[model samples]
Target chain A: MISAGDFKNGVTFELDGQIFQVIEFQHVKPGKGAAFVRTKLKNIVTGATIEKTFNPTDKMPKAHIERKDMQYLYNDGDLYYFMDTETFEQLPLGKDKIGDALKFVKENEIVKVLSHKGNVFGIEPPNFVELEVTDTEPGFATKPAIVETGASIKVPLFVNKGDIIRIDTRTGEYMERV
Target chain B: MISAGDFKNGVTFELDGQIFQVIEFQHVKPGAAFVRTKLKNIVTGATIEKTFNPTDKMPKAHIERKDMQYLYNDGDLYYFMDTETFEQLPLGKDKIGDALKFVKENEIVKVLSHKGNVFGIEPPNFVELEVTDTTATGATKPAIVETGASIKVPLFVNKGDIIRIDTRTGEYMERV
Candidate 1:
């Protein structure tokens, strides 16, 4: 267990069987109430976030989460599968667990997989991705274009079918012509 | 100008400096490269999903943001007072949506207004809450906060204990 005073960004801790990554923390001293540390935490598995206040003396168990780089493989109707580039091991994850990261990934692309005690929880795609526009119309006006994964994105007028572009996966924003 | 065939997600364009919000888009292969894009007019909240060729052109749009403090709710409407103008505006609960779970009275938030009408509201990313009710569920359990928002918490959380929640997803953060 670690003291609340010891909480820092990136610190992983366990509370009621879930793992949380601290994103922000601040110690506050009020005129009348007790001293407490305010913190923002992100759930590693669900990607949700929450904020809470803690007494400096409060202690909580630390969590150990592991991350590894794996290559995207294929998906069935229910599961998206990945392969360990080194071990050639295959792991299938549920759509709920895959979440939005699936939007940014393609077959053979490398992504970080997070797990606890051998159970996978989430996938982390690269912040940016470069993909080819498979279909779109011609002109200098803004319009929709389909990427390699069949996900549609708004693009500039100059982007044409077969043209490549960079995209910000986190915000789902078009970046620039590649 | 860019072609409609190049649309990507989260790309912003303007109709002569006017802003448009693209929620999603698609490239259709009807023997021709056609783009079907869903767009929201930032100015009027008008939404349309239309197919366009690669030759469409437009400028860019932007966010109209104002900082205001949420005062109180009058059952029929939630109120937010603009800090600069010191004026209060009434917004519907549906417009506030999930943001209602994180905001307490007198909290500051970013309000998106169109022609002086508040259509969108964004609460602070995070909030601290007091637990009011919880039930045993092994390592984690379901808990209700003082705000009446229900979330999952560690079994250690007891009534009156302070915790953190993410306003966006309404998920439990941690114990205080």
Candidate 2:
């Protein structure tokens, strides 16, 4: 268990049966109240985020997340499949579990899958990916372009069809030409 | 505009010429090198809550900081004297904003200026203030500071004791 006073960014804890990672936390001493920790948490399973306030002495269980390095094999209509890099075992996850990672990963790409107690939560895509522009209008600034995985992202105006560029998957923003 | 690696919590900078406050920033040295930041748009008062790894070489907007001493306040304007030049400047309450609640006469603060106009005020990260009113309630108690700002202090604190506070987040830090 951990006290709210010790909360920090990236600290994961379990509350009410859900695992949440602290994105931001501030010690707040209001004009006429006890000191509290105001925290912004990100849900590990659903990608949903929330802001909550806790008494400085409040205790919560530390969350233990399981991470597995797996290679993207393929996806049908609803279930996406991944192959364990070491064991060569197959794991199928639902679309909701794959979340935003579905946009950046292509067949044969590697990803980190997070789980808890044998239940798959979500996947983390590579921070940076080099993708070829499938379609976009040429311009001088930024324009929308489609990648091989069908993720529509903005690219620099100089980028044209078939041009390869780097992308930052966290914000889904254009990084630079490869 | 600065390197992501150089970002610190509460550091203010500009992006695309718009001022943004770094409300939350984390240096993630996972398997790669990058800094993830959550920025709040200063002018719009909106949070761009998405995590973004900014380029390291982006140009930063220039902001001027001046050391000024709080002098006094007339009914309509608060007065400050530049520490170096001793020149007095009368600024409206709107210019001082939330900082007025934390400062007292003769206090020194950093004034952030852009294009010759003071746009921001930075108080000392920590300040020691006397507890004016204390009401013990359980393990903690509510107290009023000399500056009229109220804060929660440990129940052991008395009305006459001086306590230190974190000005950045308005939290009790320690007793001095």
Candidate 3:
């Protein structure tokens, strides 16, 4: 068990049946009040973040999230499969668990699978993905183009069909052509 | 004496001939406990980040702040009188710097000191100044205050209008 008074950056704890990882934390002692711990936390399941203040004495269990590097094993309808690189163990998760995290990811790519106590909860895709433009991206100083992976994103005007372009998976932002 | 464990966002401590005001601090990440810090030197105006063990200790720097009224400017020296002491003192431009840009004579300002040495000055958080421009302009543009400090004012403010200025930011707050 750990307490809010001991919170640090990247500390993970289980609260409200959800696991959260601390992004940053600062303790503040206002002139008129006692010190309180404030933090920026990321929800492990949804990849969302929140900032909140907690009493110094608030206690919770330290949550350990094992990030197993896994190879993407394709998807079928509602289920997506992944194979653990270290153990060769295979598992499938419903679209409900993976959500759109794999929106820009293609099969055979590597990803980190988040697991807590043997329960697989989520997947973190690469921050950047490079794919060939399937449709003519005639450019932002950009035009919309469809990638081979089936996501439509804006690309430089100079880019054309079949161009291998680097894009950010998080925002489908055009980075550069390879 | 305070250690890293007692650090907070606004804590100030003296070490190695510097008074460090903690702007940010934390302890975390995978491993043994440690502390991360972001601080600024009040006297040198330098911001820095450093990591320390939680056991590191430092002496708390207690700043003496007194409300002093601006008196006048004489050559390179500016004078201020301690309201409570009825005593007057002079400081060079190097010490006053640009802090008095929005300050008028007889205005009350915060004089900050440490170990009997004055190091900082702060104008009131808010100050009322009259707009000295020809007239109002379109949108948010610039206007000169009575003290000659240029500031952003709304299109509604006009010549000779008494406007409240947030001296800390030098921005117009409202017209009176």
Candidate 4:
């Protein structure tokens, strides 16, 4: 458990049976008032964000999260399998738990799986990756091209069929030459 | 001349016969005080800088300045001509004043014209300048201002100093 007085940016904790990531937090001590903690948090499950103030003495549980390095193998029907690199164990995650991030990822690439209490919460792609143009038409040269992951991205006009392009995993945008 | 109220982030004006460009300016109104102007200076024809807090009501000269296109330099003189008028002028070593500290060719520069004569020439603001000389105890050194202009800097500063300079008044803002 962590005290609210020590809450900081990027800290995660369980609140109302839901996990939230702290985006911005401030500890304020007014001249004529008591110390308080003001924080902005984003719900990890729903992506909903909210701001709240708490008393300094309030306490919350410290959510223990595990980051597993995994590699994408393939998709079976409606499920995706991520094989753990170290233990060689496989975890099958549903589309709901993976959320919109699946659209930005491609098979055979490495990723980070964030799990809480053995339940999969989210997946983070590699910081950088190379992706091939799979199903874009000629008009895709001018418009934003969609990849196998379904994420829309802009590429150079000179890029053509089966051309591999460097991509930023964070925002899923096309970067420069590899 | 510009007023303290009109002082923006990168404003410049002349003082004591030397043109000074503003490095950073803030119109500060303290919790319980009159408005004050805080700024760092770029000395005309020099690479050094001095910060000052001017009186809010201080009288400043309104300058007639224009952006002119660079033509070319010859005979130890850099030439810049007005794109609109097609009029050309030659600036010698002395006429460049502080602007010579960091001048470059093919860049647009601000020209301060007074009484139909080019009183001062300003380079594009914010450039990397080199330190030419300095004091041994790290107290001060000499730096080549824009366009090869030179000035005495602090001892801690040394030659080959790649610093970001405000082109208007010739002040060194930060080391790059």
> Which one wins on TM-score?
1
Better of 1 and 4 by lDDT: 1
Evaluation by TM-score, superior candidate among 1 and 2: 1
What's the best-to-worst order under lDDT?
3, 2, 1, 4
Model 4: CA > 4 A from native: A1-18, A21-64, A135-142, A148-152, B1-176
Q: List where candidate 3 sits over 4 angstroms from the true fold.
A: A1-178, B5-10, B16-18, B22-41, B44-53, B135-141
TM-score (C-alpha, index-matched) for candidate 2: 0.39
lDDT of 1 by residue, B73-176 (tens): 89879888878888888888767876767677888889986545556887765677888898110247788888788888876789999976656557665566
lDDT of 1 by residue, A40-117 (tens): 877876778888778989998987767899998877776998998888989888986675576756888988887877
Top model number, DockQ: 1
> Model 4, range A26-73, lDDT digits (tens) per residue?
677889979888887878777798888889889899887888779987
Report the lDDT of model 4 for residue A166: 83
Candidate 2, residues B18-130, lDDT tens digits: the string is 67778887777654667777888665567886454545644465668888998888998888898888999888877778886777789988887765667777776556788
* Residue B109 of model 4, lDDT score: 80
lDDT of 3 by residue, B1-176 (tens): 99987799999999887789999998875667888999998877889998888889999988789899999999998999988888998998878988998888899999988766788898765567788883211247688988889998876778899977655446565677
Give the per-residue lDDT of model 4 (tens digit) for B1-176: 46556666566666655445555554545533333333443433354444344444233546678898766778778788888898988877567755644666666788877536576776654456666544111234556654567665654666666665544445554566
- For every prediction, compared with the true complex, DockQ reads 0.02, 0.01, 0.01, 0.01
Model 1 chain B worst lDDT run, 10 consecutive residues: B134-143
| Winning model by lDDT | 3
Candidate 2: C-alpha lDDT: 0.76
